[PDB]
Every structure is written in C-alpha cells, then in structure tokens.
Amino acid sequence: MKNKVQLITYADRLGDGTIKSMTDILRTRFDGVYDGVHILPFFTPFDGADAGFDPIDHTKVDERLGSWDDVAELSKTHNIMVDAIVNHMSWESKQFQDVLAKGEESEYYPMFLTMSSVFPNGATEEDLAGIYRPRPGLPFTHYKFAGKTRLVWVSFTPQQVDIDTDSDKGWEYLMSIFDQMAASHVSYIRLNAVGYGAKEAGTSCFMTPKTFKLISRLREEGVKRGLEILIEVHSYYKKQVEIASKVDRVYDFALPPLLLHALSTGHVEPVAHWTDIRPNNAVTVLDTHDGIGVIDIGSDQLDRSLKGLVPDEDVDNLVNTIHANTHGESQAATGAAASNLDLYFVNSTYYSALGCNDQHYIAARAVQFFLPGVPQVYYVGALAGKNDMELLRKTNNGRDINRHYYSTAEIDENLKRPVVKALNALAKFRNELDAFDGTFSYTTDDDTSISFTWRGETSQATLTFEPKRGLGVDNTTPVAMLEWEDSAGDHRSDDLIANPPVVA
Ligand SMILES: OC[C@H]1O[C@H](O[C@@H]2[C@@H](O)[C@@H](O)O[C@H](CO)[C@H]2O)[C@H](O)[C@@H](O)[C@@H]1O
C-alpha cells in the first residue's frame, strides 16, 4: 500500500452526488493532497438502512451513483480502496430468495449458515453463550426454507444472512466480487466483518484459527488479482496486536481516542506506550464514517479485569469530555448505555469532539501522519466539519451527525478556512517529503513532551508534541512544533496553521 495520504468519502456526499463528481472534486481541489481514496459502499442500493453496508447486490454499482467504468477511470490517477462484505449478504438477494422457495433443493442452499450447519450435534448453553456478539441476543432468526422453519445464522441484523465461507457457492460468490474489483483496477480491499466470517463449534466464532485460515485464503486470492487486503477489527488492544502480527494490514483504532485524551489532559505516556507496542502495518485514522470508538482503549468486553491503555475512569471522562466539548450534541446523537464502559462508539465529528479547536486538531493530524502506517482522512475531517444536527433530526440516525452532504459550493467555501488549508498543506508535506519512506524513531520526556522523528535519504523531520502548553477548548496556543531538513537545509515551524510547512 502506497505511503501517501488517502481520502475516505461517500460518493454522493462529496460534490454533485456521483462517482464522477466525487472524482472531479478529488482531482481539482485535492491534487497532491490525497492521491488515494477509500470509496464507501456504492453498490445496489447505497441508501439502505446501513448506508451502503446492506447492499442487495454487491456486484452492481448503484446506477444513481455511476458505473464500474467510473471506478476504472478514477484508478488512472488515484489508488482506490473498496469494501468487500464477506461475512453476510442481503436476505433479499436472489441466492437467499431461492433457498426460501426451493429449500434443500436450492442451488444455493449450502451457501448460507444455519444453526445445524455449525452444530449438527446439539449446542450446549456454553456453546451459544460464548459466541462473541456485536449486537444483542443470539445470532439466529427465523426463515422458512420451502415450508420448513429454520434458524439462520445472522451476526448483525436479521436481514443480513451469514454465508458459509468454506462452501463452494459462498466462495464462488466472494470471487465474483473480487473479479469485479480487479476488473475496475481497485488497489485495496477492506474486508468488512471478516472477523466473524468463520464459524466453528465451541469457539467464540470471532478471530479463531479458522478465521485466520480464511483471511490468508482471501489474501492469496487477492494478490492473484493484484488486490491487497485490509481487515477492520474493533477489539481489545492486546487482541489487536495479536491479530496485526498474522495479517498484512489493520486499522489503528486506538489513536483517535488516545489523542482526545492527551489533548484533554496533557498526559502523553499512554501515547508513548502505544507508539512502542502498536502494530506498524496499520492504516492510521482520526475520524471514520462511524462514531469514535472508545472500546479500543478499552477494557475487554467479556473480561473487565483486562485494563486498557488508560483506567476505566479516564475512558468515562473521555466520553463525557466529548459530550461537554460538543455541548450535548453527541448526547443527542449517542444512545445512552447506562454506563460509559458499555459504550462502543460516541457519535460526533472529530473536529467537534475537540470543541472545534484548530491548534488541537492540526496537532492530532500531525501525530497521525508521523506514526508508522498509511494515513487516511475522512471527508468530514478533511473539511474540518462540525456536527450536523439537521440531518440527525431528519433521519434519527445517530451516525449521520458525522455524515454531512457536502455540495461543491460548501466544499469551496470551507476550503477558504485556514485550518483546512493547514491540513491540506500538511498532507502534501506528508506525501512530498521522502523522509517518511525511511526509518522511524521517537523520544519522550515523562508526561510533558514526546518527539516523533523520521530520517530518510535526502530529508529528515521531527515533530515535538506538548499538549500541556495549551489546555482548553478555546486555547489558541500551538501544541506542536515542527523541524525538518531538505534541499533548502534546516527549517522550522512553531505554528502549523499560520505557518504551514512546505518542501523544496
Ligand atoms: O454492517 C454493520 C457495520 O459493519 C462495519 O462496522 C462494524 C462495527 O460496527 C462493529 O460491529 O465491529 C464490526 C467488526 O469489526 C464492524 O464491521 C461498518 O464499518 C459499519 O459502518 C456497519 O454499520
């Protein structure tokens, strides 16, 4: 995966509302800034309950958005990342509809998992109780095959039926997705919900050996088509290091909340700790299309005794710090959970989570770009967007607070702001300076300061980070100094907004 900054965006929420318009905005307004892009699900349909992650036909672009040729067109300039939903598919798909009509006579009957598929011999209470769950209840719902009532395995919603990833039809389906991705010259594949993709009795059915056997089989099938794979997994941070050592690339879900903590308090030990242990085969982010994950830093869900990178109280304070900085907007968006250790995510834009503080925000991006891994910037964050209460009150969907529809007018208006111009100049710096293709090193004091250093062939750069120097939502004190060496010798920048860095 190229070591340049990528953009995460919906096709219809960045420009006129299509892949062509998205590609236009990308090329015209962000040349040299984002040379790659993760296009969020654009299949048939894209405007369902789960905003593209519940497609009926994974193989077909939503004709309202464009076509696969638009993807191929965009590939001539930008590396493209796309989601591959491997765990499940729509019950409205023709494959599953056929199983309902024809039952065991159906061509696709082996393609879908049932309780019998995994538990031919009966299941105990411990068998079903130990299954890892992202959603409440048991992962089963009622469907009638021909006329016989059956318990179909469903990890998320009853409308998304899990497929047998070891069956021929299920695998044939996954390869139809891969073949279309490779046909349109997609570079990277984000394997959605792959952690649940393998079921075996007696296990949690989440990241078991059979799961790593599936990821490796999908890897080899991908390279055979020129496709690199990436796994998305939210879990306890020690499981994250375990997983990252067995796969090609993972997400760094710990950093976003860790930077919210450090910018809220000033304590940099948790960040220095994470820097030392984190997997470096990662994709770094601050915001995503979902809420801010706090589970990731992050007591274990099943066994509270395993403590995260900060005490449970600092996790509670982090959730409440977001509620305060947004003045209750994220409360309206986040459904209460009685306690904050029971929260998965907090719904708010990352800019608003910082109280819209420019100095704090640019610093967070700077740290993101200076840690090993390929950085991504979510489109709302690329525009330093605030929470969208109107869409939230229209759709009643919590995550829409961080999914604003940006017309080309709104993009060019927000492009006039200095914080936006600083981020663009920062990504260009991150892409243009060849120091980042070299070797990484870091130093720390104790709690006040931490310095991130990259030294390459023709260039060097160091980022020092002192959140102590400026505390408060309304504090304008720069908390990140930058020094770097290039063709024009040694240079410095003590303010990354007013004095954004440039390369020779
Ligand atoms: O389709 C449901 C969601 O899938 C992805 O997010 C999941 C996350 O919410 C949690 O359940 O963990 C799993 C496995 O790590 C994630 O796949 C999408 O990112 C999300 O947008 C979908 O709603």
From Swiss-Prot:
Optimum pH is 6.0-6.5 for the phosphorolysis of sucrose. Disulfide bonds: none annotated. Sucrose binds at residues 88, 190-192, 232, 289-290, 342-345, 399. InterPro entries: Glyco_hydro_13_cat_dom, Glycoside_hydrolase_SF, O16G_dom_2, Suc_Porlyase_C, Sucrose_GGa_phosphorylase-rel, Sucrose_phospho. Its EC number is 2.4.1.7. One of its GO terms (molecular function) is sucrose phosphorylase activity. GO terms for biological process: carbohydrate metabolic process. Optimum temperature is 48 degrees Celsius for the phosphorolysis of sucrose. The His-tagged enzyme shows an optimum temperature of 58 degrees Celsius. The immobilization of the enzyme on Sepabeads EC-HFA increases thermostability, and optimum temperature is shifted to 65 degrees Celsius. Keywords: Carbohydrate metabolism, Glycosyltransferase, Transferase. NCBIfam families: sucrose_gtfA (TIGR03852). Catalyzes the reversible phosphorolysis of sucrose into alpha-D-glucose 1-phosphate (Glc1P) and D-fructose. Is involved in sucrose degradation. Also displays transglucosylation activity in vitro, by transferring the glucosyl moiety of Glc1P to a broad range of monomeric sugars, such as D- and L-arabinose, D- and L-arabitol, and xylitol. This is Sucrose phosphorylase. The lineage of its organism: Bacteria, Bacillati, Actinomycetota, Actinomycetes, Bifidobacteriales. The gene is sucP.
